Amino acid sequence: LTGTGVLTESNKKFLPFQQFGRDIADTTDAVRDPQTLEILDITPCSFGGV
């Protein structure tokens, strides 16, 4: 699962079988680290109009 963004610790209550999560946009916004089983939240790197 590839992408670009900032990884932070998640406070989401993932169930034992869930590998990643999605927001209302139906895009990945959280993943389960395949080695540590730590749940990480994914947010885009700071951006905006200039």
């Binding site: 670009t4 209302i24 946009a25 139906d26 885009p44 905006g48």
Partner: protein
């Protein structure tokens, strides 16, 4: 069922019968109009291609479509501030009410700013405000005028209206006692000024009660601000739809641009990407077109709201149903989320009774016509009274005029015209 169009009401029409109000009430009605729309902004390239260089390069093959889309949304965003300014920024000075709210019994505490509140909103404005994507390149720009600034414009308009009537909307603000201002507004609806003064206490009480009813009506009626909520819902829905379209394949192996790029080399990846660009570009064009059409509707509403600020609030209107139902006296603007609320104060005739009438009085062989009012009979005596409020005066040469003899007017009646 088959819907009713209203109760039937037969008017007791005859060639010599008139109904004249012996009383009236002060009605306050609420008109709610959209003024502005959320200033959304969509980064065309980011929406379609994210941060993919390969997609961006393909997107360039479509020419300047993204420039047009970014430009169209920018144009809307600018309009939204123009709409707000046209409605609220109609006063050059910021007027303030006096420390002592003595308006002859007229209580404006529910429409004037509440000084105990950090938000500096009126009790009613506070109620109105209580009642009523980014990661995909969909951002929202703030209004130039904040809610606080809009509230300040509104309070300035209220202060002007209360202390100087409509004069501040024409030239300099000329102070006038509120009761006297209301008397002028009574004259403006064909009701003599003595009616205001003689019933000043009653009128102030009817007004104060009506305002209290407004706050309760809004509080107990969640649908009251549906007109403003509908605007919010339509735009939120449009954005949600735009975002959801990013999950569509449009014929591609995947809606996810990164998955295509991680699996395929350019010779094949470009085909799959081209399908996503076409679909996403089309989705964005659909969104922008709908926003432009919707923006036009909001603009029209804002123009109406602006007209109802110059008229209704900064002056008394003669236009029927323009400033509420009934005979317009005055209006008070209130700030609201992306819109304006007008409290229209109208004079509503009440408790009418039947009188016998005549087009003229015959006296000394001459035909006498009323100068201002109408000739009415209570069954034994003829009087002349103002048309909008029963006030039976003795018929005299000082309230009638003469034109022609008694053999011309149809329905002319014989009576005595008193000479002082």
């Amino acid at each position: 069922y088959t819907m009713s169009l209203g109760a039937e009401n037969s008017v007791a029409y005859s060639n010599n019968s008139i109904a004249i109000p012996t009383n009236f009430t002060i009605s306050v009605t609420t008109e709610i109009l959209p003024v502005s729309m959320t200033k959304t902004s969509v980064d065309c390239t980011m929406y379609i291609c994210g941060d993919s260089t390969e997609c961006s390069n393909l997107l360039l093959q479509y020419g300047s479509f993204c420039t047009q889309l970014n430009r169209a949304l920018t144009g809307i965003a600018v309009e939204q501030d123009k709409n707000t300014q046209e409605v609220f920024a109609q006063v050059k000075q910021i007027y303030k009410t006096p420390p002592i709210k003595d308006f002859g019994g007229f209580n404006f505490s529910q429409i004037l700013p509440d000084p105990s509140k950090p938000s500096k909103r009126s009790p009613i404005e506070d109620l109105l405000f209580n009642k009523v994507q980014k990661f995909n390149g969909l951002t929202v720009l703030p209004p130039l005028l904040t809610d606080e600034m809009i509230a300040q414009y509104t309070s300035a308009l209220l202060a002007g209206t209360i202390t100087s009537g409509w004069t501040f909307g024409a030239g300099p603000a000329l102070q006038i006692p509120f009761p006297m201002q209301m008397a002028y507004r009574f004259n403006g609806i064909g009701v003599t000024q003595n009616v205001l003064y003689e019933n000043q206490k009653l009128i102030a009480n009817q007004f104060n009660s009506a305002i209290g009813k407004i706050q309760d009506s809004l509080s107990s009626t969640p649908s009251a601000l549906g007109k403003l909520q509908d605007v919010v819902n339509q735009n939120a829905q449009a954005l949600n739809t735009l975002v959801k379209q990013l999950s569509s394949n449009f014929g591609a192996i995947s809606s996810v641009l990164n998955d295509i790029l991680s699996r395929l080399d350019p010779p094949e990846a470009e085909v799959q990407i081209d399908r996503l660009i076409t679909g996403r570009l089309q989705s964005l064009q659909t969104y922008v077109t709908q926003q432009l059409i919707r923006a036009a509707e909001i603009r029209a509403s804002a123009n109406l709201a602006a007209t109802k600020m110059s008229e209704c609030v900064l002056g008394q209107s003669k236009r029927v149903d323009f400033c509420g139902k009934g005979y317009h006296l005055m209006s008070f603007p209130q700030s609201a989320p992306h819109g304006v609320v007008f409290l229209h104060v109208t004079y509503v005739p009440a408790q009418e009774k039947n009188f016998t009438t005549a087009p003229a009085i015959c006296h000394d062989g001459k035909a006498h016509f009323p100068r201002e009012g109408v000739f009415v009979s209570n069954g034994t005596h003829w009087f002349v009274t103002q048309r909008n409020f029963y006030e039976p005066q003795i018929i005299t040469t000082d309230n009638t005029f003469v034109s022609g003899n008694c053999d011309v007017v149809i329905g002319i009646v014989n009576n005595t015209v008193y000479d002082p």
